[PDB]
């Protein structure tokens, strides 16, 4: 009765730390549209640029 | 296991929710699998705090797009472009915004440096 009844973290590490993992691998999840974002971002603007551009030339 | 307590005659709607917890910040491919399927039966304010824990924006959207918080899917396609927009698949939740404002800074994701089809984009508004 006093066991259940008496009742109603006992090793933080594979416990708790192990939420660093799931937390690591998407930090570097994480990465990549941004970055990707700008370098793809910049070669095609520009590539914009010269529609416009060549939009100038062949109309004059 | 959850992949047949879903399935028993007794199914109830905690099951495809917390199903989701796992499927957020953990496998991703399959997570978009499962919501597509299971939208209905679910919660949704919690899940995108499960969500935003998972910046899943292919699936993080869709789930604003029923959820109906327009605003907020559409806005998913500004900082996340490669992730979840899809030609006009952008197109057809604005119309269904309350505030304006989003469009003119939208152009710019669009009309800024999306030319040809940007246009296409000034048509329906």
Redesign the interface.
Known sequence: XXXXXXXXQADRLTQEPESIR??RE?QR??LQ?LD??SK??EQ??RE?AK??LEEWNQRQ | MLEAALGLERAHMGMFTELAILYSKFKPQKMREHLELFWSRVNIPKVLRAAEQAHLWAELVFLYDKYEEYDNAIITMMNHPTDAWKEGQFKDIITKVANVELYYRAIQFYLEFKPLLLNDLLMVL
């Open positions: 799931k937390w998407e999840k994480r549209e990707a974002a793809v971002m095609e603007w914009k529609k416009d």
